[PDB]
Structure formats: structure tokens, C-alpha cells
Amino acid sequence: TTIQQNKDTLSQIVVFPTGNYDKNEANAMVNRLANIDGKYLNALKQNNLKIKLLSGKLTDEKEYAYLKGVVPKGWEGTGKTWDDVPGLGGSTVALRIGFSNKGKGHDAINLELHATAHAIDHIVLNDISKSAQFKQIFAKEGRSLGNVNFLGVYPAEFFAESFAYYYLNQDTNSKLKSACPQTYSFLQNLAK
């Protein structure tokens, strides 16, 4: 689908916050999500997945208050809790506006694409990151995309970050193709 179609899809699943926030930056986050293949976005929409953009801390939302003080998986030793984490992906998606870029409380290439990749993995693709096919790819290429002690340890995180590289822009797409050829082909074939 075109960018126009994907933004149309995203206008039906993206939820904007009540309080004040940077409207232009929220729009920029939507624009980057619009690079995701429309097949995935419409599957998320069919499953009533909402992409919640947040004006404050994740745990300030009523539905995430249960995570206050909880140490996220893989963040052991960081001294941080979910209160300080700018994004969440999986059965739901919640993203703090303004924290997209690497270094804004995270080291993902892009916050919203990484988090939405987790939701696509889990909701649309039946946890494909844990499939035998992807485990063999992850075993070979899981350390070729940096942050090897994190991406190289958790297949779901390698899937999510590889997904983000594939769709952020053409430079990251090409960088993935050179560093992780089997992962690139896997994602290319997955999208038809």
C-alpha cells in the first residue's frame, strides 16, 4: 500500500494523548510508522491494536500503572524501571512523544518502529521471532547489528530491531541487507 493508504490506516489505530504535546513530532512518528508494509498495519487494525502516543511517562497511564517500580526484562543492572522507559511493544503499543531517536532513553534505531515490530511479531505473526526458521537466522546474524549483548541474546529484540532497520529509511534498509542478508531476505519474503 501507498504512504497515503498507510497514513489512512494509522489514523484509525493511532491514539493521541489528551494533554499537551508536540503535535509536529507526533505527526513525524506517524510518518515513520507509515513506512511499514500496509499488510502488517491493516492486520494490527483488524486485531484492534491501538498505537498509543503519550505526553508523559509510560506508567502515568492508568493501564500501565501496574508497571511502576518494575524492572523491564533485559534492563537488569541499568538501575532503571518501567517508569523511565519511553516505549512498550507487544500485546499493546505505547510510545512517549519526542523519544523516537536513538539515545532518548533507549538505544533502538527508532522507538516506534521497534515497539510496533514487537506487536507485529506477537499479534500478527504468531511470535515468528521464536520460530525454528528465525532461530537459525538469529543464531548466525544476531550479533551483526550492534548491541550484541542485547540483540544477540533475545531473538524477539533482534527481530524487532531488524524490522526497524528494514522500514526506517533506505539507508537503514541497505545497512541491514549488507550486515544481515538472511534476515533481510526473511523480512523481504515475509512482506510478499
Partner: peptide
């Protein structure tokens, strides 16, 4: 299921 971003 919840997953945090890369630290």
C-alpha cells in the same frame, strides 16, 4: 506481553 526498547 510487554517488551521494552533496547537499553
Amino acid at each position: 506481553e510487554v517488551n521494552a526498547p533496547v537499553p
